[PDB]
């Protein structure tokens, strides 16, 4: 009885979530960052829910105008906001380190035991449009910039992106 559902996901082995490509060099513009997927769950067909982890050198939360994922290939929208003064979304405590859930479309990876998500960007905007300007004049970097995530735009082992996208087993299976 207890094992039968009442009507009409699989989490991926964490060790099997890893980068979908490697390179000798990656783009090094903007503050240093560490951006990766840390878990995946199969929803249905080519749709998964993933945990994106972000760490980067930053200003303070009060300086932050907007922080969002853009260009996302997803059934629930091309944009996910993590912080937006203008749209009133307040989902993180610290801009330097946070996770977020993303629902994403996938495609078959080179090794077809795995699937991978599509390229996307993380746009960061500081010190404008109602954000505090305190400490913004000591900031060495631009006030607005984008981390580019992808396994595309790679020539002879050099990527023009900041970080790879991630792959994980198809259906979050344990076969791989
Ligand atoms: Na948080």
Author numbering: 13 to 20, 25 to 192
Task: Please quote the authors directly.
Flo11-type adhesins are of interest in the context of kin discrimination, because Flo11 from the budding yeast Saccharomyces cerevisiae (ScFlo11) confers cell aggregation by homotypic protein-protein interaction. Moreover, Flo11 confers the formation of diverse multicellular growth forms representing cooperative communities including biofilms, invasive filaments or adhesive aggregates. The structural and mutational analysis of different Flo11A domains demonstrates that homotypic Flo11A-Flo11A interactions depend on evolutionary conserved aromatic residues, which form two bands at the Flo11A surface. By employing biophysical (SCFS), cell aggregation (QCAM) measurements and competitive biofilm assays, we demonstrate that Flo11-type domains from diverse yeasts confer efficient cell-cell adhesion at single cell level and in populations in homotypic configurations and are able to efficiently discriminate between kin and non-kin variants in heterotypic situations in vivo.
Despite a sequence identity between KpFlo11A and ScFlo11A of only 32%, their overall structures showed a high degree of similarity with an r.m.s.d. of 1.01 Å for 102 Cα atoms after superposition. The core motif of KpFlo11A, the FNIII domain, showed the highest degree of similarity (0.70 Å for 61 Cα atoms derived from the β-sheet), whereas the neck-like subdomain and the apical regions deviated from ScFlo11A. The surface of KpFlo11A exposed 6 tryptophans and nine tyrosines that cluster in two bands, which were similar but not identical to the aromatic bands of ScFlo11A. To test, whether KpFlo11A can also establish homophilic interactions, we performed SPR analysis. Similar to ScFlo11A, KpFlo11A is able to undergo homophilic interactions with a KD of 31.8 µM. We also measured possible heterophilic interactions between ScFlo11A and KpFlo11A, where we found a clearly decreased interaction with a KD of 121.1 µM. We found that KpFlo11A confers efficient single cell-cell interactions with Fmax values that were comparable to those of ScFlo11A. Similarly, KpFlo11A enabled efficient cell aggregation at the population level. We next tested heterotypic cell-cell interactions using KpFlo11A and ScFlo11A, showing clearly reduced Fmax values in comparison to the homotypic configurations.
